[PDB]
């Protein structure tokens, strides 16, 4: 059946998502979404609930129209926050709908949005200062502005080290000058290429 291939893809898509294979989760869940019978909106919506965070982790943000169309406006402020690098808004938006997200089974996956939100925040700092040697204290200012409690220079280094290790940021920390030295060629790769 087409209904059974759709159900199969739905579940292996969820498996992949929970194993942090987001490219594969995207393949399976996209397929399920697209081949789901146009008539069953309830089915399409359930799939979208999983496909959404997976898309977002790969740098594809949903339109507010999509979210309206399937009554998933719970994702709207989260999407806006992630897109901006607005950690403070992300935290609030996640809390506001904590129960829904948990009942959807995607709460922990949504937590992974903090990683790319950090990435987006730091990219904005780079775009605003327009230099390839960025003082670590500038990132600290951004994180204080986002009200990360107790944050200090050591924490900025730890966050940057994780982003560099994962491939989100192309550069290295020079401790003599407390600078982040980033590549002159596009130091913030598209999120779909970091996977």
């Amino acid at each position: 059946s087409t209904a059974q291939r759709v159900t199969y893809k739905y579940y292996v898509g969820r498996k992949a998502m929970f194993d942090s294979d987001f490219k594969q989760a995207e393949e399976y869940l996209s397929f399920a979404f697209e081949h789901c019978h146009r008539s069953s909106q309830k089915n399409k919506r359930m799939i979208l609930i999983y496909l959404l965070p997976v898309k977002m982790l790969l740098g594809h943000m949903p339109t507010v129209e999509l979210l309206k169309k399937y009554h998933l406006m719970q994702f709207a402020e989260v999407t806006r926050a992630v897109s901006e690098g607005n950690l403070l808004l992300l935290h609030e938006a996640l809390a506001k709908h904590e129960a829904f997200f948990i009942r959807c089974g995607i709460f922990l996956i949504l937590e992974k949005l903090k990683i790319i939100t950090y990435r987006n925040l730091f990219k904005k700092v780079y775009l605003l200062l327009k230099t390839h040697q960025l003082s670590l204290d500038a990132f600290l200012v951004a994180l204080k502005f986002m009200q990360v409690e107790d944050v200090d220079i050591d924490e900025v280094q730890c966050i940057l080290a994780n982003l560099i290790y994962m491939g989100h940021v192309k550069g290295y920390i020079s401790h003599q000058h407390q600078k982040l030295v980033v590549s002159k060629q596009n130091p913030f790769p598209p999120l779909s290429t970091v996977c």
Binding site: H60, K124, L127, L129, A138, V141
Partner: peptide
């Protein structure tokens, strides 16, 4: 349905402006 253009190199939005003010407030300008 899906947007990628959010991740261009444009900083004309409200949040960007607020962060720009905060940075300048601490001594950081381009």
């Amino acid at each position: 349905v899906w947007e990628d253009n959010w991740d261009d190199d444009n900083v004309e939005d409200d949040f960007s402006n607020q962060l720009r003010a905060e940075l300048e407030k601490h001594g950081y300008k381009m």
